[PDB]
Design a protein around this ligand. Sequence first.
Ligand SMILES: NC(=O)[C@H]1CCN(C(=O)Cc2cc(C(F)(F)F)ccc2Cl)C1
Ligand SMILES: [Zn+2]
Length: 139
Amino acid sequence: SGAIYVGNYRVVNRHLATHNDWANLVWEDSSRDLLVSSTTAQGCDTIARCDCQTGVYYCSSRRKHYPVSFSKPSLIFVEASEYYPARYQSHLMLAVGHSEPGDCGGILRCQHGVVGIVSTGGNGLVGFADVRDLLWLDE
Ligand SMILES: NC(=O)[C@H]1CCN(C(=O)Cc2cc(C(F)(F)F)ccc2Cl)C1
Ligand SMILES: [Zn+2]
């Protein structure tokens, strides 16, 4: 679990969105595993606007943060799970690191701010849904 709070928005993994998230829906994209809902309180997370390929992510299954090198956002085949059939997920970045299903939502940050959230894993890899292209989160 985990979310990004920026301005009047909350960014979560689409497969983990709650009833309140869907009732206050702003935007969702199944192909990216992202959902954005509106909030009443103001968020203070800073979103990175960059092409960094190094950062640190929070891994809840180890209660630790790990530094990683990660790929640029791309269309990657993602194996079937209980939330989606086998499909290509877009805007996904992979790194070598530990991830279990409950780790979805952990934030990946670079020196510029929030880069994305854990969205996939398995085989010693961890995948992050990018949010750096969502320029409207700031306005
Ligand atoms: N973005 C997606 O399609 C998500 C939906 C839920 N997803 C998962 O559970 C995949 C997953 C599997 C494992 C493994 F290998 F241990 F079984 C570890 C971590 C993750 Cl996130 C993908
Ligand atoms: Zn950066």
